[PDB]
Amino acid sequence: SKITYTFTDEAPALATYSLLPIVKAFAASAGIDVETSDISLAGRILANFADRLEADQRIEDDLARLAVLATSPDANIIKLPNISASVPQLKGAIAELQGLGYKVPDFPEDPQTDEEKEVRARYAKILGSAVNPVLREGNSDRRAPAAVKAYARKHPHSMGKWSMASRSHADYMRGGDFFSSEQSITMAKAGDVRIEFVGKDGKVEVKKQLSLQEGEVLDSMFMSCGKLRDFFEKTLQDCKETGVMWSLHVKATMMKISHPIVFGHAVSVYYKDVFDKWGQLFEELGVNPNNGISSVYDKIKSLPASQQEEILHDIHEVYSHRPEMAMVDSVKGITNLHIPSDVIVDASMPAMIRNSGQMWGKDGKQKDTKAVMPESTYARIYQEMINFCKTNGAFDPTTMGSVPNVGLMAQKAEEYGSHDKTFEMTADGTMRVVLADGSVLMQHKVETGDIWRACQTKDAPIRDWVKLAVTRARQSDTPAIFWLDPERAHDRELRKKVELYLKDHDLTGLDISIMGYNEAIRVSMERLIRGKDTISVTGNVLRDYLTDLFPIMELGTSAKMLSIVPLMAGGGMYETGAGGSAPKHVQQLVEENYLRWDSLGEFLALAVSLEETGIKTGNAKAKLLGKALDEATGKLLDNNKSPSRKVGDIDNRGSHFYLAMYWAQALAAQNEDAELKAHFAPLAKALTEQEATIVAELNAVQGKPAEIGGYYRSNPELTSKVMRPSATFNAAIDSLA
């Protein structure tokens, strides 16, 4: 009676086959119903194309149901990481469902007819981050629990040594990006607004109309595609002169519209010699550089070997005139520019800094790198961290402090809801935003090919943000900084509200300040290295970047964080860490039947999820399920029963067993409730005694390839046997309820 559990993609999906059955049994002992909501990428494709499925094979639209549940005050969701698909990934999902019999329409890369444009629009809703903006209806409280830090200090993860002579650096545009042109206003009263275009010849197009609440913040900006292509050529030339490897770090997944244009311009510029010679044949075949260089590799298959061989050689000649670039997989030849979703800035840049500031090249060796991030707004903080490591060495998890995050995200704050307000200018002219009484609010001169966009942030999420920041500052006794850039128009609007709403709360004994981004990360890092903590209070995007960046230094992986979402209706969402769906863990499983995914983020969320039920439902026992799990996670940390990444020990599957065994024990041991004490004694010691052959039956699989049938919609019977192979263990768990 209250817990919704999320079935997602890739590695967390496989973890859930082993872990969810154990959760359902234990939870049942407190009279708790544990629902499964399918928000996977293939599951969402079926849910939106019901009209193309036989009624018997239709499925229920779980995202829509989960989106309504998030607005109810009874919500209790456990949210595991899920895909934000690029176009290549969507094309792969469609192709797998089609080969299973579902007649779902192909993705229309060029839609000419009106019926083609409606299939495109239906698919557009499924692309990108379709889940998180719909679920996140409170702000974000993300922090490392004390026990997790204690574990990291006793068992430090590897950290690459940093040389003061390193040549690695981050490069970003100086002029010509969003940072350069940003404008922002705050509405004094509710009202309508119009997004207008006035060309040079004088033609007017009313792009969109919007209704905004009273205290609503609205921003406006554009990027010059001319200066972008210019920038790309300069970064490539510089790498060629200096001998340092080129790399690209954007967020083409979440930034559905803008960053593929950026990604595609990087491709056009990099392989410019190929696109210049074969421009017409490529436009004929429909190659789209916004999908990566893979687009060319794919579409030339329909051509004759004589002529495609001519193209494979002209690409080789680009790689001899351009600088070396980073590799996603050196063995298979998969490049940084291959598909847009491989290298995602928030995961990739912490990986590089942790690895001595280096990435892998053509030869399989790591080397110094220029990390290209065209947009200046959030690029600059990585430069401050790169220089800090050059000067002070690599971070030390043994003595390090902590940087938690309180994050503004409710109701699609800032850049997250901006995709319906984003256009690629088709002519020279100006873009403006007018009050409908004619008053011009914001204005930009633009040129053909440039990207223009606007963003909305509402006053209620902001009040909740400031309030959550003050609470955390009091609850721990730790200074907090609002990262607001004084040269950003949007951040100046935010600062008026923050300065105002801080006065609505009692600041006695509290250290709260406001700084631009570079000063804040510098102050945070200077405190960090002296063993002290700082809370970062940031907007929506920095919430993402920093809860990847600092946790990977401190803990080795994002997945070992608490991530609590107090929903504004009164409920709660508990995300299983601050990481992603670890697609590389899938390659290892299909190939040699080891899953290194660490489910600690799940255990941590679950224990908070059960205490929430206890409080809201006054379910005394379910509250005890919680602290028995805290103990359960405690002994897993204390006894280092997490997965190692060596193929002769326990993996993800074995770790769940060890969690179940101490969770059973701590309940068989306690005397607080004689019901549950007797309830879990038959399972407790049964798991204990049989421990060695459970582990042997788990570990007996390693080595052998695992044929789960499919990737995006794997075969459930097949997949479930691959993940629950200790038939000894299964009936111990089956025979609980």
Ligand X SMILES: O=C(O)CCC(=O)C(=O)O
Cβ-in-10-Å burial (0-12, 13-18, 19+) of 284 comes to: exposed
Which does residue 21 bind out of ligand X, ligand NAP, none, counting CB within 5 to 8 angstroms by kind?
Answer: none
114 assigned binding-site residue: no
Pairing type for strands 204-212 and 169-171 reads unpaired
The answer to the question of whether 329 is labelled as a binding residue is no
Taking CB under 6 A as the criterion, the residue among 200, 445, 584, 646 binding ligand NAP is: 584
Binding region for ligand NAP (CB under 6 A) out of 396-404, 500-508, 555-563, 718-726? 555-563
81 is in an annotated binding site: yes
Asked if 581 is part of the footprint of ligand NAP (rule: CB under 6 A), the reply reads: yes
Which of ligand NAP, ligand X, none is residue 354 near (CB under 5 to 8 Å by kind)? none
Q: Work out what residue 571 binds among ligand X, ligand NAP, none; the CB cut-off runs from 5 to 8 Å by kind.
A: none
Provide the token pair at 53: 């499925």
Q: Which of 191, 199, 361, 583 binds ligand NAP (CB under 6 A)?
A: 583
Residues that bind ligand X (CB under 6 A): 84, 129, 132, 253-254, 544, 578
Cβ distance to ligand X smaller for residue 228 or 254: 254
Closer residue to ligand NAP in complex, CB, 348/619: 348
* Residues 404, 651, 97: CA angle, nearest 5 degrees: 90
Name the token pair of 303: 């051509």
Question: Which one of ligand NAP, ligand X, none is in contact with 464 (Cβ closer than 5 to 8 A by kind)?
Answer: none
If one asks whether residue 82 binds ligand NAP (CB under 6 A), the answer comes out as: yes
Residue in 249, 394, 346, 352 with CA at minimum distance from that of residue 549: 346
The entry of ligand NAP, ligand X, none near residue 160 (CB within 5 to 8 angstroms by kind) is: none
Q: Closest distance between ligand NAP and the C-beta of residue 344, in Å? A: 4
Q: Which is nearer to ligand NAP, 339 or 347 (CB)?
A: 347
- Is the separation of the CB atoms in 490 and 217 below 8 Å? yes
- 598 scored as a contact of ligand NAP (CB under 6 A): yes
Question: For residues 699, 705, 710 and 714, what is the CA-based torsion angle, rounded to 10 degrees?
Answer: -10
| Residue 585 known to bind ligand | yes
- What residues have CB less than 8 Å from 68, skipping those under 6 apart? none
Gap between the Cα atoms of 415 and 184, Å rounded: 13
Q: Quick one: which segment of 79-87, 412-420, 468-476, 478-486 binds ligand NAP (CB under 6 A)?
A: 79-87
Q: Is 270 annotated as a binding residue?
A: no
| 540 binds ligand NAP, rule: CB under 6 A | no
Which residue among 344, 409, 489, 573 contacts ligand NAP (CB under 6 A)? 344
543 annotated to a ligand binding site? yes
- Residue 559 near ligand NAP by CB under 6 A: yes
Tell how strand 405-407 and strand 572-575 pair up: unpaired
How open is the CA angle 201-207-209, to the nearest 5 degrees? 135
What residue 559 binds from ligand X, ligand NAP, none (CB within 5 to 8 A, per partner kind)? ligand NAP
- The token duo for 684 is 């407790």
Burial of 591 from C-beta contacts in 10 A (0-12 / 13-18 / 19+):
exposed
CA distances for 674 relative to 622, 680, 728, angstroms:
14, 10, 27
Of the listed pieces 264-272, 445-453, 557-565, 670-678, which binds ligand NAP according to CB under 6 A?
557-565
Q: CA 728, 729, 734, 737 torsion: positive or negative?
A: positive
Query: Residue of minimal CB distance from ligand NAP?
Result: 580
Can you tell me which of 26, 483, 597, 680 binds ligand NAP, judged by CB under 6 A?
Answer: 597
CA–CA separation, 78 and 568 (whole Å): 16
Strands 405-407 and 327-329: unpaired
Q: Which is nearer to ligand X, 410 or 733 (CB)?
A: 410
The site partner of 235 among ligand NAP, ligand X, none (C-beta below 5 to 8 Å per kind) is: none
**Among 395, 451, 378, 347, which Cα is nearest to 160's?**
395
Burial zone of 92 (CB within 10 Å; 0-12 exposed, 13-18 middle, 19+ buried): middle
Query: Considering the complex, what minimum distance in angstroms separates the CB of residue 599 from ligand NAP?
Result: 7
Residues 249-278, interacting with ligand NAP (CB under 6 A): 253
Nearer to ligand NAP among residue 583 and residue 710 (C-beta):
583
Task: Write down the least CB distance from residue 597 to ligand NAP, Å.
Answer: 5
Give the tokens for residue 65.
Answer: 């149901």
Which residues lie below 8 Å from residue 422, measured CB to CB, with a gap of 6+?
A: 257, 258, 451, 452, 453, 454
> Is residue 566 classed as helix, strand or coil in its secondary structure?
strand
Q: Judge whether 649 is annotated as a binding position.
A: no
Residue 432 labeled ligand binder = no
- The tally of CA atoms less than 13 A away on the side-chain side of residue 493 is 23
527 known member of a binding site:
no
Per-residue interface string for the shown chain with ligand NAP, residues 601-630, x marking contact by CB under 6 A: ------------------------------
382/484 Cα distance (integer angstroms): 16
Distances (CA, A) of 439 to 184, 218, 432: 15, 15, 10
Q: Answer with the entry of ligand NAP, ligand X, none that 340 interacts with (C-beta below 5 to 8 A by kind).
A: none
Structure-token pair, residue 421: 């307000």
Of residues 354 and 724, the one with the C-beta less far from ligand X: 354
Whether residue 459 is annotated as binding a ligand: the answer is no
Q: Are 106 and 123 in contact (CB under 8 A)?
A: no
Q: Which does 261 bind (CB under 5 to 8 A by kind): ligand X, ligand NAP, none?
A: none
Alpha helix positions (H), 271-418: 272-277, 279-285, 294-299, 305-318, 345-354, 376-392
Stretch that binds ligand NAP, among 76-84, 191-199, 487-495, 612-620 (CB under 6 A): 76-84
From 110-118, 208-216, 593-601, 694-702, span contacting ligand NAP (CB under 6 A): 593-601
Residue 518: Cβ within 10 Å count: 14
Asked whether position 81 contacts ligand NAP by CB under 6 A, the answer is: yes
Binding site for D-threo-isocitrate: residue ranges?
A: 142, 543
Binding site for Mg(2+): residue ranges?
A: 346, 544, 548
Binding site for NADP(+): residue ranges?
A: 79-84, 132, 580-582, 585, 596-598, 645
Give the interface with ligand NAP as residue ranges (CB under 6 A): 81-84, 132, 253, 341, 344, 347, 557-559, 579-584, 596-598
Binding site for substrate: residue ranges?
A: 129-136
